[PDB]
Amino acid sequence: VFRRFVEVGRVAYVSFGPHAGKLVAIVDVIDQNRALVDGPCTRVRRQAMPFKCMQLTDFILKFPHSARQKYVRKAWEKADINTKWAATRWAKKIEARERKAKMTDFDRYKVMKAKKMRNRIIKNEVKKLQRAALLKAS
Amino acid sequence: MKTILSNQTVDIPENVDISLKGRTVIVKGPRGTLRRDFNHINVELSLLGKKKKRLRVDKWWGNRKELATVRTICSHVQNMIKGVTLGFRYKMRSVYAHFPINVVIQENGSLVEIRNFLGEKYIRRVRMRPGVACSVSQAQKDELVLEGNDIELVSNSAALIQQATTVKNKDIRKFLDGIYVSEKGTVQQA
Amino acid sequence: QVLVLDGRGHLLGRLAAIVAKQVLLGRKVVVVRCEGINISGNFYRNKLKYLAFLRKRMNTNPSRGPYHFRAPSRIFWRTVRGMLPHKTKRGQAALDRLKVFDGIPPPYDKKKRMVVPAALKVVRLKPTRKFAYLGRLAHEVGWKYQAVTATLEEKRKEKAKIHYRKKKQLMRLRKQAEKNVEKKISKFTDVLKTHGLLV
Amino acid sequence: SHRKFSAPRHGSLGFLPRKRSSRHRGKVKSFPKDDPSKPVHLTAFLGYKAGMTHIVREVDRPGSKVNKKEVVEAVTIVETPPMVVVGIVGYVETPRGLRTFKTVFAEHISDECKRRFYKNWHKSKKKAFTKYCKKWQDDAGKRQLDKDFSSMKKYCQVIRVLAHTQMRLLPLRQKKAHLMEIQVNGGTVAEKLDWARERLEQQVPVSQVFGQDEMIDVIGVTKGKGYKGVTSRWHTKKLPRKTHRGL
Amino acid sequence: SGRLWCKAIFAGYKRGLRNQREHTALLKIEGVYARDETEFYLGKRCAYVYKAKNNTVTPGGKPNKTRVIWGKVTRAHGNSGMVRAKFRSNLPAKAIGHRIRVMLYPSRI
Amino acid sequence: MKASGTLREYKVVGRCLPTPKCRTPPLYRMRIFAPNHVVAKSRFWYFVSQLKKMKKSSGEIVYCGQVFEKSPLRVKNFGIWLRYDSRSGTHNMYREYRDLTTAGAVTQCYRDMGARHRARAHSIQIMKVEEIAASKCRRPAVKQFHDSKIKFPLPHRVLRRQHKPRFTTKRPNTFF
RNA sequence: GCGCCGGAGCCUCGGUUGGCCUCGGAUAGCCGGUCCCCCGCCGGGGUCCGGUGCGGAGAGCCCUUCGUCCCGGGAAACGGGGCGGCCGGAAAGGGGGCCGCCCUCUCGCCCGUCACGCACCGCACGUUCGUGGGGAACCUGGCGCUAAACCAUUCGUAGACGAC
RNA sequence: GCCACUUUUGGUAAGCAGAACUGGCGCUGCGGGAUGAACCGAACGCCGGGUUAAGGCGCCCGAUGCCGACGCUCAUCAGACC
RNA sequence: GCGGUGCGCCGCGACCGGCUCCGGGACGGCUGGGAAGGCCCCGGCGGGGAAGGUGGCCCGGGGGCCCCGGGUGUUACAGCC
């Protein structure tokens, strides 16, 4: 069964295209494979968008299927999508991906020197848990 | 075109219990438990209503050769519900002109020896596929009652003995012999 | 230094096309479990094409003829050879680089298998079309070892299930270790979270 | 044009490399398929052909024209001394076939069986299995042997025992015996190896293998007749008398 | 104390179907598979390194058996990040599918 | 004409040259569809030679301009009347499309005419394209988008971006 | 005069320049936990709680190499390195895990204090797997082995000659 | 002498025989049409760089390893380029 | 020191010119003196229109006031032209 449905008023993260990496709000459905869309609080101008570049997410904001960009902006900033998206787990791992893409050489060194000991402490904690489980097993 | 949505609901009676493991269905009721694996048919199976009243199958974006599979799932599921609540009884009768067909049931329903068909000495041993039972009935002269849950096993075991009792190399329009399916129906009437 | 590819779910020539070019580029490729390779189109068309390949035969001496290899691994080897230029030294060096097995033998059961999504049947076929299993076609056409390979694959699936349970309980110990030690690795964790490795 | 009068084909293509065979004694290409219900039994033997003889017997087959009459029938006598078991061979089933796992011989091996490992028994100093037979009378050695019998119990599927003829009982010139793997078809791998190692190093006669009134299959190389033409080998029709370059 | 060259594979010469032009190598560089990513590698010093039987000199060191054929990386080749290259001597066809180093030091960063 | 890219709508007018017979000819106007104005003026002289007694030489263009879509942010239904040549005999058609722009609907018309009927753009000649309100729509594949509560998922998301990870360890997920 | 275990070099073939030690599998569905519930020789199902453009992520994980010198903090103490016994492998068999041992260490890792190490004067094949594969004699010991094949003769189950 | 677009005669027809216009082959390589006297592109001193034509871009085999667009299509004889 | 000529061999760099393939900024013209869209209905004042019909009302059922289905009708607690 399904849980994300293309309908009037779903926001969708966009995979690729000109507007890669932004949310849009799907307004109306043109074809089997294309839809009139508008992200008004994220600078996506009112346009058509094929479905196979947009990843529909779990935020539905209610407005009619012919409403103008004024009312789409009203529903967007009343539902306050731009903080729910920054708070959800999707954009946290998007932004973490962008952080380690942005990672310079010197902080790549710092991350190496950090995560070496951050794994050493884990590894000896793991093996002392293992010997504790052995002494409880016998 | 492709139709954007085609759905049908199937009403599930109070005594029977369907449930879902993904796309396959399992049915528990009075007579037994019967499952079927629909993993070749590419649909959505919602089990809606609390007290589990309706099984709604829906297909999104289908051509007509695959929208045809929408209510055939409904037919298989409601045939399954009929076979679990009430069961299936195929009464197939023996028809002969001169030589009587001797049907003797072995291993309590599971094998049928058919003898003296057209007078010939070759014994026809037909095995019921597992889960159905053949029996020579009373209050009818030459009848074979095939009882089971699922119609594919019942009617297929019937069709095996109907394809066994066949007249070959002669005129089938004159030689009307063999056992033929007479009365399809139900073990326990509603 | 060696690609180990799984063969389950991959189309025959659509996998052989990536493998052929990748071996001409100097890799060493081990395509393993080649009785799970799918072929598109239905089973009866596919075995009719293979029986046509069997009927094509040198007339005066079939000992010189096309050696129809019946094993699934060697059907896939023959189709990679069809895509490679095997009459010359670089194509023969490519066929020396390629190794192909039926089932998953003990050199490679203890390794992790790759997959190619660009050749994979869940991607490159419509879901209502018919496909055909190369292992069942090869058994159907004269390969003799479906049963023994199936039992050996059942054995290795059991032993890999034991390995996977132990790896699960190790990683449970790892996360319980992290939750026990986060107070004194917190200064090492947050410098990884600010560089986007850990959110 | 076509063939004027259709006639069936001379000879058979099934037996096609009509060559001198590589092996002198005939080998078994297939034993009977074992089923674990039976008791364990050897599924072959090995005896030597002596000659030909009549019999006279009364045939009791109902419905023939020879029912309760009295035929004569040609018989063949295969002199068949009891064979001596010398070692057992295990086999594991592989996706490439069925390969041999671990051959284990007996301690004492008769000299007529030892002759088989020598192309010249005269000039050799007869050193075969002398380092191997020491693996039985020391404790580390028979611990190694119990280890690989335990391995053959775990990993093998078919088990076949080496047995040789007992040539010193035959009126022949040769002394070098014949060795053969005979498949032990019967119970499980455990019961199979138990039977095989308890009858290791000792004899087994004919009657434990075959019973009287039992159809068997006979394997061997034919009587060699030399390099011969198409008329005497393939039985084609002789061309007529008038033929210039031979008929 | 580590590697200072990118890994590349000598895929072939610059060739038509019934004609090859041995003055231009085709290099497939590992990791880059698109023309937006191939722009870093233009004008880089690339080198085919091989051993031989008898000793040759080595600049800043002892005579040893390793030898080179140096070259530049001229321009991209096709959409898949395949690149062209030109070398001082044209490469032997031994090198088809062997590891040509692509250095970093003609740097534009 | 080959239907290269998206078509554009050209309003193009023309007339005969002034003759001593009549001082001024009447002016003739067409909505035509072409990739650019050169092939547009060619198609104009094609249809006006097919209708009137007018040619490239005895006539002249007056204004070949483009009509922009007067409301390109509202999805609209388009009824398109057609006249195309099969392998055997020509046929009149009425096809409905659903698009933002009139030129986009006529581009889509040429595309699925070439798809379904193998009709090529020299064979297909247009005659009347109008914007049709949602109750006058006759075609089922267009009418089944006329729901204010339209709702459908995207069931089998086939994997785009295949060769970026080419040799990976994960089987791809096609449920989103 | 040969094979195993325990040194410096010579000839030749070259390719390489960190490892990834593994569930099964679905794709209109998955992954991970809990077990409070129920059975089987820990496994499996049900309920429930998490994630699901996969983050328990191959867009990934592990290791990370300038060296030494003092002294200080965090981590470690149960750990590092080095001899006996227990098992784990057959499809083409695992250089793995475990119990102690006499030894020795606060050295290994992360932040700091302190300087030193041809700073070879801007310049290429540098940095590895490398005790690499194959071939010769120099070699010093110890535990071990002193065989067959072919011709020739013979047989005649075989045979053109070989072969058998 | 031969071939080819179109015109055209005889013959059912022909990789047949006979003409007209023009271009080719013969005398002519080269890229493409897998293969090839004539077809498509194009005519040539020996070379370096760039770019194209016709034809192409899963692999042989250079180039689609585009997150190419819209449809049609199931073949137990699929279809695939003057 | 100046001018010419060259380095035994292997290499590197610099700027200048020619020929090319790209990349990145920025400015302007024309058009229906662009078309639409943005902000000041829930742009201003009155007037209408229907539907891919929002409220509300009714009918039905899945529930625990929400959702779903159908009907009515014209801005209402959504909007469009």
Ligand SMILES: [Mg+2]
């Ligand atoms: Mg008759």
Ligand SMILES: [Mg+2]
């Ligand atoms: Mg005939």
Ligand SMILES: [Mg+2]
């Ligand atoms: Mg004569």
Ligand SMILES: [Mg+2]
């Ligand atoms: Mg080196």
Ligand SMILES: [Mg+2]
């Ligand atoms: Mg002519």
Ligand SMILES: [Mg+2]
């Ligand atoms: Mg000329």
Ligand SMILES: [Mg+2]
């Ligand atoms: Mg020419």
Ligand SMILES: [Mg+2]
């Ligand atoms: Mg051709």
Ligand SMILES: [Mg+2]
């Ligand atoms: Mg031309």
Ligand SMILES: [Mg+2]
């Ligand atoms: Mg032309």
Ligand SMILES: [Mg+2]
């Ligand atoms: Mg050139």
Ligand SMILES: [Mg+2]
């Ligand atoms: Mg080609």
